[PDB]
């Protein structure tokens, strides 16, 4: 049973879905379950009581949204089962889980219990013929067509940098933080309350993400932007009430570089990139500096790559060619590589079959991934 396999690119922010051997994912929607706050007195209302995908995006105001995954670690397992069921259902894929093999994704250095419980869901509740779990960095390099590359990614949950060299992922050189797009959006919300405009509800939270996506930029020199007085640019809500953002637009993404702003001493994006290259072997460093690949949504800020270059120039050894590459399709880079990996004939050997899972259990899944 070797049908056209499915590529479920997981993530706390957005969940991409579709079939193998495609250019772009057809089914992209945000990873959250929406349930109504209010009472439904009047008949002919929105049925189901559980809202996932474009219905939830359309009807935010009703729904008390709650994210099942934080930092690539599913907290609420019932909510992820409903989302994965919604992905497979007639509203998106229009196919059964029994037909196609599954390509799952996870962030590196995650809890092994979550990986086991993920496999349990796909093998038992859904009846998958074969499952395979993979990393974000390996898939990003598949999409570009390279083998050598440091993959500095920045999603909604996790930021990390896996240094791969000619098809050799070094597991001990991996640097990871739990500071990313969601924490920047949460940090922007806190600033907007200090400015004046308060947002508190979960439906109301996604307005702050939309402000962060649209009107934010990274200053090349933050001390210079502090000393100077900002212009105070405007933004229109779905309501229509105007919001003067002020200095919070440039100070919000500084959480990525200075994680001491949230009050949680970590490395930072630029330090993680340097530390990943430094932890690897001596002869591999110059090739890893030349091949720096970007991916994820929190790399899309204005002047992000310019500042990320300047920080590498400050930290790294002098007179070395730094090249921070970044494709046009950064958001779907991980899905594209999964679709390419799924289309290859070697894919049949790498996966974990249902029969192999029933015999061995979790140990066989831990062996095949690494």
């Amino acid at each position: 049973i070797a049908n056209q396999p499915v590529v479920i690119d997981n993530g706390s922010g957005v969940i991409k879905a579709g079939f193998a051997g495609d250019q772009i994912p057809k089914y992209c929607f945000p990873n959250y379950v929406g349930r109504p706050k209010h009472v439904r007195v009047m008949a002919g209302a929105l049925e189901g009581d559980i809202f996932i995908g474009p219905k939830a995006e359309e009807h935010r105001g009703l729904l008390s949204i709650r994210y099942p995954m934080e930092h690539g670690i599913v907290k609420d397992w019932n909510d992820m089962e409903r989302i994965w069921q919604y992905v497979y259902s007639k509203e998106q894929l229009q196919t059964f889980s029994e037909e196609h093999p599954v390509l799952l994704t996870e962030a590196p250095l995650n809890p092994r219990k979550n990986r086991e419980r993920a496999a349990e869901v796909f093998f038992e509740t859904f009846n998958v013929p074969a499952l395979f779990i993979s990393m974000q960095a390996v898939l990003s390099l598949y999409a570009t067509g390279r083998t050598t590359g440091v993959v500095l990614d920045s999603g909604d949950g996790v930021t990390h940098a896996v240094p791969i060299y000619e098809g050799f992922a070094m597991p001990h050189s991996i640097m990871r933080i739990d500071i990313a797009g969601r924490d920047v959006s949460r940090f922007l919300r806190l600033y907007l309350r200090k400015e004046g405009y308060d947002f508190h509800s979960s439906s109301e939270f996604e307005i702050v993400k939309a402000i962060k996506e649209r009107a934010c930029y990274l200053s090349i020199n933050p001390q210079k932007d502090e000393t100077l007085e900002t212009e105070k640019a405007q933004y229109y809500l779905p309501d229509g009430s105007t919001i003067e953002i002020g200095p919070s637009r440039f100070r919000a993404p500084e959480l990525l570089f200075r994680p001491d702003l949230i009050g949680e001493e970590s490395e930072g994006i630029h330090e993680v990139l340097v530390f990943a290259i430094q932890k690897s072997d001596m002869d591999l460093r110059r090739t890893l500096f030349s091949n720096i690949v970007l991916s994820g949504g929190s790399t899309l800020f204005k002047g992000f790559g310019d500042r990320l270059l300047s920080e590498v120039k400050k930290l790294a050894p002098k007179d070395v060619k730094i090249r921070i590459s970044a494709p046009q399709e950064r958001l779907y880079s991980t899905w594209i590589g999964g679709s390419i990996l799924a289309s290859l004939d070697t894919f049949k050997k790498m996966w974990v079959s249902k029969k192999e899972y029933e015999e061995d259990g979790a140990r066989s899944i831990h062996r095949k991934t690494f």
Binding site: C28, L300, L309, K313, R323, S325, A326
Partner: peptide
């Protein structure tokens, strides 16, 4: 190509100049 989010005029990469 089709889909909601893209960036126009960032470029593929930012590279330092190669010396002799």
């Amino acid at each position: 190509m089709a889909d909601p989010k893209y960036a126009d005029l960032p470029g593929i990469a930012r590279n330092e100049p190669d010396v002799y």
